[PDB]
Write a structure and sequence with these properties.
The structure is a homodimer. By secondary structure, chain A is an alpha/beta fold. Chain A is built from 20 helices and 11 strands. The first copy, chain A, is globular and about 85 Å long. Chain A starts with a helix and ends in a 6-residue tail after the last helix. Chains A and B meet through helix 1, helix 2, helix 13, helix 14 and helix 15 of A and helix 1, helix 2, helix 13, helix 14 and helix 15 of B. Bound molecules: a molecule of 2 linked components (NAG-NAG) (2 copies), pentostatin 5'-phosphate (2 copies), 2-acetamido-2-deoxy-beta-D-glucopyranose (NAG) (6 copies) and zinc ion (ZN) (2 copies). One 2-acetamido-2-deoxy-beta-D-glucopyranose binds next to helix 2 of chain A.
Chain lengths: 497, 497
């Protein structure tokens, strides 16, 4: 079969070429400028991989984000991805998507903010305009007083940040198991819950999400939000439709201010710890908001730790209720599903129910590669999998990110969008850190700008924009992309090759 | 309405899940009534341990480092059942790493003319010298007999030898916390034993111990990688590879004539992939000759040693294609270690492409295979079994939580797989039971039971290199062992009725 080296080379290159064509982005044809940028990216990628391989040292893009963040930021591939327009971030949580630094430097400088140390020795924050809060399990102190008496305000503010962020130490070392790091993650939300549900802080925090995401060259976001319970200084507690209206008004003002930004849409989330009786009411609520806020309210999702809590099947009559009405109602679902290392259990079989329920996208889908028939349904229906790589590493599904279970999905061209999940919780950027690790760890050394470009286009093409909005957003994205290519050729001194 | 009732929903759900069950390894097996009684007990135990980890929020011990899991698994019913179970064959083993370090200590280092020294890295080394102490090149050699007699504690002395040689004295994931640190320790182990284990009578007896130990773990057949080379006598005489093969052939014949309940052994010549292509060319020609003159005992050729930093298959391609280019062609079988890596799109994982273009009979490890869909197709189409060595892949730095092992998605697609132990002597594993336990508990799901075990066992004979007559006989023998195991198991676990 191979009398000479040319025949062997031809067969080898046919097989390898077939796989390169099959994977995400493999059918893209780059133009001549894109090819110059691609050649540089591929030279850079090869040099870091070959150094790790042949000089026998760890591959930094795949280690704990705690260790790799400060390392990746100085490299050309990272700087290119930082400049690159991302399209959309489609998997985000609204209390976890702006900087803890803003909570500290802005929110905790507002009037009537209190702090206490809880019984686990973490700081909690809240607002009370009607006296200090009751000493229920902790002793509340006015932040303004504690800060002014600290003797070192910079250290005091840095201590707040350090006590709240999950990247203050390496979570893989400090919280070295799934349930320990989920204990720390849940705790983070408890620390901020009081302050971040105060209505004007909540409003301004959401506006900060939009500002930070635009600043990372993201033009569109879909965000999970609980919507409900925002409270005023006088103790007024608002309902979920108010919370939705609040976000709508902020988004409209943001898009008026920044016509280079496509905007935002919202998914109602509820934690999967509640009785089925209550989930039923949240489904009904979501049916009403979907009918009355078409094109801003998207649908429903169930969140919180997947392994120990209620499965989709545990809520199946609630989730089937819209489809069973006369006439039927198609309430879109965005289920977090298969965020687990388990196989053949109630947890990863959530992926089956997600498909039976016609999920528009799947959150995480870490277990999906263990399910060949679910993979085929995902591919044939075009159900995008929202892949959140830093989240899956820090929250205990994988250590070396080259073992991330989405790499084999991308190799088969399962539809995938990259997102950051909870970037504010662990000091990530809106998209650039997660896109970097996806690019360096979840695809191969010979995968270049075509993969980046496809993942960026995917985030618009599998968004929940209607077809007209998608066409408008792609025109804007194409203009950004063209500017990014020209700028990059100038910046990396590539124009003459 | 697609699902107006619970029955309509569960019908669809169960057909989908069942369709995946039929597709995975073992999915077409129909257990008889006795097998079903045992299977029901295995599945109750499996669910009990998984549900405890999941709902009581504690780590799943079958998936943690073997250093931690070994003593815990050994007291459990599922482990004890797998221990009693006939394994069929171990198809991926190295002949200097497949018997107990305890035997090296209690037997080999009690022989005349055995010397020890501490090397510059503070590790003990052992060798044989018939003339006097070896030249004190980078260490000071001392007669082991004298050192033992003067230790002041013989049992502590022997225990220290074992502790200084074993990779399971501490947890390698802690003590050597990177791929290249643990490969440094693994390489060191071979250097520690190399002198003593290449002395001819010790090497003969160590190979016999491999056979005895594997038989004792209810393994009836082995295929073994060996260098065959450099076996040396007390007077300094160094034997050629053909002598090493003839030596193993005689040990094997005596063993099978002693034990009709054991099917036997066959040998694969291995060469380390750090050598110049001229050396590999000589070993390829050697392998052609031994394949011709020892049919049915000499199987073919393999390249071993660390895959990432050393020479690729393509680096030796002129040598590896040489048999097929003879007139008339000569079809030298290959059993390449391939894709034992976390890299993607590099020279290392593309070894999988060359392994299939060179018509490999089986592939060793294939850890990267799930990232290569076109290679998967060829592996399935041609029946090229992947030798999966789960404890080895964890301890030697490819994966931490074995539920992330890259063979679980292969098994879910019914890629042909055999489980093996690789270097069980190096880290105190049993011949097969520990690896079979971690494969069963980590690489398939909670609802996968005795049918998966039975299929992996049968696979190890079906994808052995036995000829038609041998294989028919071995499968009849395996069936008999299996029936005895089922009957004994029902009595032992009080499952009758
Ligand atoms: C959050 O802040 C508290 C209060 O400063 C930290 O408590 C300190 O913890 C270290 C180590 O546990 C001790 O040396 C100090 O004495 C503790 N101080 C007090 C007042 O208890 C706590 O470690 C912080 N938690 C995190 C996760 O950063
Ligand atoms: C192999 O044995 C040597 C010699 O006993 C060990 O070196 C000792 O390491 C201990 C750690 O417990 C030190 O306290 C001693 O000082 C060391 N002794 C000497 C003479 O250096 C070495 O650690 C062992 N290596 C392994 C991998 O077990
Ligand atoms: O109720 P809130 O909106 O104030 O808190 C946010 C809610 O979202 C949950 N969540 C946030 N990031 C994730 C979540 N869940 C599951 N997978 C991991 C990750 O993707 C936590 C809390 O229940
Ligand atoms: O020279 P010897 O035969 O005495 O030592 C054995 C030779 O096999 C090598 N080896 C042993 N276990 C494996 C090996 N290689 C690659 N992957 C991991 C594992 O599967 C080490 C040495 O080169
Ligand atoms: C390994 O390191 C040396 C020295 O730092 C460097 O010169 C060399 O290029 C590196 N090798 C690779 C393949 O990067
Ligand atoms: C906080 O943000 C608000 C609204 O965006 C702004 O008015 C105010 O000045 C900020 N506070 C600080 C301390 O920057
Ligand atoms: C899912 O969508 C299909 C195709 O539109 C529709 O026929 C079916 O009724 C839907 N199923 C559910 C459970 O809502
Ligand atoms: C959790 O642990 C408790 C205490 O050992 C035990 O009673 C219970 O059965 C456990 N739950 C599961 C599902 O194993
Ligand atoms: C070592 O093994 C040989 C070969 O089986 C046996 O004859 C000899 O007695 C053994 N040595 C010891 C100390 O048992
Ligand atoms: C591989 O096997 C095929 C089919 O049996 C045969 O035609 C071909 O010559 C072989 N190629 C090599 C390189 O041995
Ligand atoms: Zn999420
Ligand atoms: Zn091996």
């Amino acid at each position: 079969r191979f009398p000479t080296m040319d025949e062997y080379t031809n067969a080898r290159e046919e097989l390898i070429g077939s796989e390169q064509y099959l994977r995400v982005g493999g059918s893209i044809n780059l133009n001549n400028k894109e090819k110059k940028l691609n050649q540089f990216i591929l030279r850079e990628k090869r040099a870091i991989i070959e150094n790790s391989r042949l000089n026998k040292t760890q591959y930094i893009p795949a280690v704990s984000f705690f260790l790799s963040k400060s390392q990746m930021e100085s490299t050309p591939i990272f700087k290119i991805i930082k400049d690159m327009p991302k399209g959309a971030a489609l998997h985000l949580h609204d209390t976890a998507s702006a900087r803890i630094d803003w909570i500290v430097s802005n929110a905790t400088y507002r009037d009537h903010v209190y702090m206490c140390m809880d019984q686990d020795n973490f700081v909690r924050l809240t607002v009370s305009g009607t006296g200090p809060p009751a000493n229920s399990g902790c002793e509340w102190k006015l932040v303004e007083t504690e800060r002014a008496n600290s003797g070192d305000i910079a250290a005091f503010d840095h201590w707040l940040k350090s006590n709240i962020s999950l990247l203050t130490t390496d979570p893989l070392v400090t919280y070295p198991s799934l349930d320990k790091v989920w204990g720390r993650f849940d705790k983070h939300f408890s620390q901020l819950r009081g302050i971040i549900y105060h209505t004007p802080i909540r409003r301004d925090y959401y506006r900060q999400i939009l500002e930070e995401f635009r600043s990372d060259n993201v033009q569109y976001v879909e965000v999970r939000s609980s919507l409900s319970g925002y409270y005023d200084l006088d103790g007024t507690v608002h309902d979920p439709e108010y919370g939705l209206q609040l976000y709508k008004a902020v988004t409209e003002e943001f898009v008026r201010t920044y016509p280079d930004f496509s905007g935002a849409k919202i998914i109602k989330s509820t934690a999967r710890v509640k009785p089925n009786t209550d989930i039923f009411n949240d489904v009904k609520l979501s049916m009403d908001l979907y009918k009355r806020y078409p094109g801003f309210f998207l649908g429903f999702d169930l969140v919180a730790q997947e392994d120990p809590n209620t499965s989709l099947l545990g809520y199946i009559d609630s989730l089937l209720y819209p489809s069973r009405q006369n006439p039927p109602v198609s309430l879109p679902y965005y289920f977090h599903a298969g965020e687990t290392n388990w196989q053949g259990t109630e947890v990863d079989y959530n992926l089956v129910d997600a498909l039976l329920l016609n999920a528009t996208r799947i959150g995480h889908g870490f277990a999906l590669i263990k399910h060949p028939r679910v993979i085929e349904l995902v591919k044939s229906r075009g159900v995008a999998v929202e892949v959140n790589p830093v989240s899956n590493q820090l929250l205990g599904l994988v250590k070396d990110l080259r073992n991330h279970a989405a790499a084999p999905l991308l190799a088969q061209n399962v539809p995938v969008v990259i997102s950051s999940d909870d970037p504010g919780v662990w000091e990530a950027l809106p998209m650039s850190h997660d896109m970097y690790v996806a690019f360096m760890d979840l695809v191969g050394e010979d995968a270049g700008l075509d993969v980046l470009k496809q993942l960026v286009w995917n985030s618009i093409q599998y968004s929940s924009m209607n077809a007209t909005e998608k066409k408008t957003a792609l025109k804007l994205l194409q203009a950004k992309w063209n500017n990014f290519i020209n700028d990059s050729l100038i910046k990396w001194k590539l124009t003459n090759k």
